[PDB]
Amino acid sequence: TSLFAAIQPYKTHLLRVSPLHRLSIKEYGNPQGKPVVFLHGGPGGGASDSDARRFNPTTYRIVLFDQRGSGESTPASCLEDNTTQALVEDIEKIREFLQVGAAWHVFGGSWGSTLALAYAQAHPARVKSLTLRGIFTLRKKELDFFYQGPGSSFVFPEYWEEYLDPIPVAERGDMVKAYYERLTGSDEKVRAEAGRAWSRWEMATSRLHVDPDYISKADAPGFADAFARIESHYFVNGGFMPEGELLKPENIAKISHIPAVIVQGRYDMVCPITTAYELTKLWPEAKFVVIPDAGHSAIEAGTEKALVEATEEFAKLA
Amino acid sequence: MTSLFAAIQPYKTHLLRVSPLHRLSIKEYGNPQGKPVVFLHGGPGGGASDSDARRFNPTTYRIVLFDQRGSGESTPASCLEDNTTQALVEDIEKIREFLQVGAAWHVFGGSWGSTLALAYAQAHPARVKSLTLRGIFTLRKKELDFFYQGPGSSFVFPEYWEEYLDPIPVAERGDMVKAYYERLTGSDEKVRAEAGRAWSRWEMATSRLHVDPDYISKADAPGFADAFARIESHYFVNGGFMPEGELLKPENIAKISHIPAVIVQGRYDMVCPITTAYELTKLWPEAKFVVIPDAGHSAIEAGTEKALVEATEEFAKLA
């Protein structure tokens, strides 16, 4: 493995960011190292100790946190005031609170790359580098390809069937809305059932080979409820941005000078390579790394290796 | 390191007239005394090659290869006149009798070849000893739209998708297949050549898990590319000359449900995605399903090929 040793944090924090929300923040590695912030995906997936393993513990001050309503951040599964703009501002609140300094490296995959791009475009001076994987910009066609069909539905038809099951046929015209309404409804069984099914779909389609250890995560109600509720919340709302906002030239120009690597699995069936590719066209300064036998996940062998190579190289930035 | 039998040349070649127009090149390999098997190449319009004979034990099988109308060495090259599914189906029968193979034979086909295999078996189930099928393709609208129209494979191979869109003015992009067909059958020769290359390239680029430059260069062969694209577009724009979903109708699946069969399907087949194969297995549970987790479309994907030879080896036990 190209992963550094398993590692526990040297400090944990609880930072209030609104009268409602409270973010769990965990610092790993060298307190004197180069500051880097990890943005977990989902949205609503939360971070874990293992995500700290992609950064050299001697070189980096590694900052992990769980975005609103996810992981250990409170209140769990809370959809009130849980928007892209809020999350973007939260990263800034964390940056100052931890006194990391003026700028830091940023690391994100999937929804994490969405937040990274939104953050960098809103505060390009705060970003030393961008290590991006499984590019996701929440465009309609992106979400339709995965949640609506036809799309990934054709490559994983057996799981697609499972995913369609909780939704009456008449409502199948908008899967995300149909799920969101159940995930936010008053009936608890359906909300749990919908959380599991929604989550399972993604777990089952996240790697080249179907991983039963990935799939069983949907059977954890704690994870599945927040994961599904927050995902469906953002997705049904277009990530609270105009269509294609992140890919507009005027916005790409704000971050075109920021040292960057895009690492993308060729067979990513959650966030297909067309989005990443399109980004590379708008942003040729960025380094493009396609993994020919990897799906979506960061732990695909080739993706992981390239990711660590990115953090290693970016540590040379002054 | 391969499950392929040795490279092999035919012991006899034939030219069989099947219409006033068409004339099929037929090539026999292996043991004249062996169990008869007919290989149906894909495309449609791709033609067969000597290498396709390598999936059958040369001691055990009488291996019959032929190029379907207008493809390969069959004449006239790239001819779209009287080139339909029904005609191809009847051709297989004309070959069967002509070669005096006997009452029945094994059938082997992938992609368009599985389409022809299914059509053939449904029309003459008594003539089929077994069915070895790969990359299932039944020419449904959603199948053709997923690959040629988008969104679909377009999302996984965006750089090649762009190349494929390029020859077509954007106002015509609403129906890619018709826009291609009209160019592929137009009077302007450059456009026709250009369209043949681009259409063919798209498929070559998307046919294996790893992009194979040796596959891709085949589109740069105008001889191949012109017939390949013309015939593909011809059938596709015509729905394979069958009602929507004809092959998958229960009453038709019932005609072949008893026929020993194996479906071998690549999980990441981006030309003929696994949903079709999967749906077939639901209608046809008697059939043996083999999914290859790291294979795309092509028969030569490592796992697909291995499973294919295992199928011919096992089916050779059939009395």
PDB file of all heavy atoms in Angstrom, chain A residues 8-21:
ATOM      1  N   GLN A   8      -4.007   8.015  14.714  1.00  0.00           N
ATOM      2  CA  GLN A   8      -5.031   8.626  15.545  1.00  0.00           C
ATOM      3  C   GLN A   8      -4.716  10.106  15.712  1.00  0.00           C
ATOM      4  O   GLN A   8      -3.559  10.499  15.630  1.00  0.00           O
ATOM      5  CB  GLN A   8      -5.094   7.914  16.894  1.00  0.00           C
ATOM      6  CG  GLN A   8      -5.903   6.629  16.859  1.00  0.00           C
ATOM      7  CD  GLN A   8      -7.391   6.900  16.923  1.00  0.00           C
ATOM      8  OE1 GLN A   8      -7.833   7.759  17.680  1.00  0.00           O
ATOM      9  NE2 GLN A   8      -8.172   6.181  16.121  1.00  0.00           N
ATOM     10  N   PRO A   9      -5.751  10.939  15.917  1.00  0.00           N
ATOM     11  CA  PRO A   9      -5.515  12.383  16.015  1.00  0.00           C
ATOM     12  C   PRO A   9      -4.803  12.793  17.305  1.00  0.00           C
ATOM     13  O   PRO A   9      -4.969  12.120  18.318  1.00  0.00           O
ATOM     14  CB  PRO A   9      -6.933  12.971  15.983  1.00  0.00           C
ATOM     15  CG  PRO A   9      -7.822  11.875  16.459  1.00  0.00           C
ATOM     16  CD  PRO A   9      -7.190  10.607  15.959  1.00  0.00           C
ATOM     17  N   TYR A  10      -4.028  13.878  17.263  1.00  0.00           N
ATOM     18  CA  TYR A  10      -3.379  14.411  18.469  1.00  0.00           C
ATOM     19  C   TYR A  10      -4.270  15.401  19.215  1.00  0.00           C
ATOM     20  O   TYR A  10      -3.995  15.751  20.359  1.00  0.00           O
ATOM     21  CB  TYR A  10      -2.019  15.059  18.150  1.00  0.00           C
ATOM     22  CG  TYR A  10      -2.057  16.239  17.189  1.00  0.00           C
ATOM     23  CD1 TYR A  10      -2.454  17.513  17.612  1.00  0.00           C
ATOM     24  CD2 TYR A  10      -1.663  16.086  15.868  1.00  0.00           C
ATOM     25  CE1 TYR A  10      -2.477  18.593  16.731  1.00  0.00           C
ATOM     26  CE2 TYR A  10      -1.680  17.151  14.981  1.00  0.00           C
ATOM     27  CZ  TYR A  10      -2.085  18.399  15.408  1.00  0.00           C
ATOM     28  OH  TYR A  10      -2.097  19.444  14.498  1.00  0.00           O
ATOM     29  N   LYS A  11      -5.340  15.843  18.556  1.00  0.00           N
ATOM     30  CA  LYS A  11      -6.265  16.814  19.130  1.00  0.00           C
ATOM     31  C   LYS A  11      -7.625  16.687  18.428  1.00  0.00           C
ATOM     32  O   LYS A  11      -7.686  16.492  17.215  1.00  0.00           O
ATOM     33  CB  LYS A  11      -5.674  18.226  18.970  1.00  0.00           C
ATOM     34  CG  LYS A  11      -6.374  19.351  19.749  1.00  0.00           C
ATOM     35  CD  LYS A  11      -6.317  19.154  21.269  1.00  0.00           C
ATOM     36  CE  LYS A  11      -7.066  20.283  22.004  1.00  0.00           C
ATOM     37  NZ  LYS A  11      -7.315  20.013  23.464  1.00  0.00           N
ATOM     38  N   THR A  12      -8.714  16.755  19.187  1.00  0.00           N
ATOM     39  CA  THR A  12     -10.051  16.827  18.591  1.00  0.00           C
ATOM     40  C   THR A  12     -10.765  18.081  19.089  1.00  0.00           C
ATOM     41  O   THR A  12     -10.489  18.561  20.182  1.00  0.00           O
ATOM     42  CB  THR A  12     -10.925  15.610  18.915  1.00  0.00           C
ATOM     43  OG1 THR A  12     -11.353  15.692  20.277  1.00  0.00           O
ATOM     44  CG2 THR A  12     -10.168  14.315  18.711  1.00  0.00           C
ATOM     45  N   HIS A  13     -11.672  18.617  18.281  1.00  0.00           N
ATOM     46  CA  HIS A  13     -12.354  19.860  18.621  1.00  0.00           C
ATOM     47  C   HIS A  13     -13.826  19.804  18.291  1.00  0.00           C
ATOM     48  O   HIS A  13     -14.268  19.050  17.414  1.00  0.00           O
ATOM     49  CB  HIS A  13     -11.784  21.037  17.837  1.00  0.00           C
ATOM     50  CG  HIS A  13     -10.346  21.315  18.108  1.00  0.00           C
ATOM     51  ND1 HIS A  13      -9.926  22.108  19.156  1.00  0.00           N
ATOM     52  CD2 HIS A  13      -9.229  20.934  17.447  1.00  0.00           C
ATOM     53  CE1 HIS A  13      -8.608  22.188  19.138  1.00  0.00           C
ATOM     54  NE2 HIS A  13      -8.162  21.488  18.108  1.00  0.00           N
ATOM     55  N   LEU A  14     -14.582  20.647  18.977  1.00  0.00           N
ATOM     56  CA  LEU A  14     -15.978  20.838  18.644  1.00  0.00           C
ATOM     57  C   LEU A  14     -16.131  22.322  18.417  1.00  0.00           C
ATOM     58  O   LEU A  14     -15.918  23.119  19.340  1.00  0.00           O
ATOM     59  CB  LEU A  14     -16.857  20.380  19.798  1.00  0.00           C
ATOM     60  CG  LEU A  14     -18.034  19.485  19.445  1.00  0.00           C
ATOM     61  CD1 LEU A  14     -17.665  18.481  18.363  1.00  0.00           C
ATOM     62  CD2 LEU A  14     -18.509  18.771  20.682  1.00  0.00           C
ATOM     63  N   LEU A  15     -16.447  22.702  17.182  1.00  0.00           N
ATOM     64  CA  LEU A  15     -16.561  24.118  16.867  1.00  0.00           C
ATOM     65  C   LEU A  15     -17.969  24.463  16.429  1.00  0.00           C
ATOM     66  O   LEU A  15     -18.483  23.930  15.431  1.00  0.00           O
ATOM     67  CB  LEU A  15     -15.556  24.529  15.794  1.00  0.00           C
ATOM     68  CG  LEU A  15     -15.684  25.959  15.278  1.00  0.00           C
ATOM     69  CD1 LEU A  15     -15.414  26.950  16.413  1.00  0.00           C
ATOM     70  CD2 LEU A  15     -14.758  26.200  14.067  1.00  0.00           C
ATOM     71  N   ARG A  16     -18.577  25.363  17.187  1.00  0.00           N
ATOM     72  CA  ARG A  16     -19.883  25.894  16.881  1.00  0.00           C
ATOM     73  C   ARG A  16     -19.785  26.816  15.699  1.00  0.00           C
ATOM     74  O   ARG A  16     -18.949  27.714  15.683  1.00  0.00           O
ATOM     75  CB  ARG A  16     -20.336  26.725  18.047  1.00  0.00           C
ATOM     76  CG  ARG A  16     -21.773  27.082  18.009  1.00  0.00           C
ATOM     77  CD  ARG A  16     -22.253  26.850  19.399  1.00  0.00           C
ATOM     78  NE  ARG A  16     -23.509  27.500  19.697  1.00  0.00           N
ATOM     79  CZ  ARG A  16     -24.650  26.843  19.850  1.00  0.00           C
ATOM     80  NH1 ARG A  16     -24.668  25.519  19.699  1.00  0.00           N
ATOM     81  NH2 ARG A  16     -25.769  27.511  20.145  1.00  0.00           N
ATOM     82  N   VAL A  17     -20.647  26.625  14.712  1.00  0.00           N
ATOM     83  CA  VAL A  17     -20.572  27.461  13.527  1.00  0.00           C
ATOM     84  C   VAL A  17     -21.899  28.176  13.251  1.00  0.00           C
ATOM     85  O   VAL A  17     -21.974  29.094  12.427  1.00  0.00           O
ATOM     86  CB  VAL A  17     -20.082  26.659  12.315  1.00  0.00           C
ATOM     87  CG1 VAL A  17     -18.636  26.246  12.531  1.00  0.00           C
ATOM     88  CG2 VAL A  17     -20.969  25.442  12.091  1.00  0.00           C
ATOM     89  N   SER A  18     -22.937  27.767  13.965  1.00  0.00           N
ATOM     90  CA  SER A  18     -24.235  28.398  13.826  1.00  0.00           C
ATOM     91  C   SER A  18     -24.939  28.176  15.160  1.00  0.00           C
ATOM     92  O   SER A  18     -24.390  27.498  16.032  1.00  0.00           O
ATOM     93  CB  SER A  18     -25.005  27.812  12.619  1.00  0.00           C
ATOM     94  OG  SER A  18     -25.916  26.785  12.985  1.00  0.00           O
ATOM     95  N   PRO A  19     -26.131  28.767  15.357  1.00  0.00           N
ATOM     96  CA  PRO A  19     -26.814  28.485  16.626  1.00  0.00           C
ATOM     97  C   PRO A  19     -27.282  27.035  16.695  1.00  0.00           C
ATOM     98  O   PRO A  19     -27.749  26.579  17.738  1.00  0.00           O
ATOM     99  CB  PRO A  19     -28.020  29.430  16.583  1.00  0.00           C
ATOM    100  CG  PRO A  19     -27.598  30.543  15.681  1.00  0.00           C
ATOM    101  CD  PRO A  19     -26.796  29.855  14.614  1.00  0.00           C
ATOM    102  N   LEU A  20     -27.136  26.322  15.584  1.00  0.00           N
ATOM    103  CA  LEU A  20     -27.675  24.986  15.431  1.00  0.00           C
ATOM    104  C   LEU A  20     -26.546  23.986  15.287  1.00  0.00           C
ATOM    105  O   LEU A  20     -26.488  22.987  16.004  1.00  0.00           O
ATOM    106  CB  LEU A  20     -28.543  24.952  14.181  1.00  0.00           C
ATOM    107  CG  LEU A  20     -29.633  23.894  14.113  1.00  0.00           C
ATOM    108  CD1 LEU A  20     -30.345  23.834  15.459  1.00  0.00           C
ATOM    109  CD2 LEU A  20     -30.580  24.251  12.984  1.00  0.00           C
ATOM    110  N   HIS A  21     -25.635  24.274  14.362  1.00  0.00           N
ATOM    111  CA  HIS A  21     -24.630  23.304  13.942  1.00  0.00           C
ATOM    112  C   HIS A  21     -23.321  23.397  14.698  1.00  0.00           C
ATOM    113  O   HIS A  21     -22.918  24.465  15.139  1.00  0.00           O
ATOM    114  CB  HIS A  21     -24.358  23.439  12.450  1.00  0.00           C
ATOM    115  CG  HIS A  21     -25.494  22.987  11.593  1.00  0.00           C
ATOM    116  ND1 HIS A  21     -25.683  21.664  11.249  1.00  0.00           N
ATOM    117  CD2 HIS A  21     -26.506  23.679  11.022  1.00  0.00           C
ATOM    118  CE1 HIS A  21     -26.760  21.565  10.495  1.00  0.00           C
ATOM    119  NE2 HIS A  21     -27.276  22.773  10.340  1.00  0.00           N
TER     120      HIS A  21
END
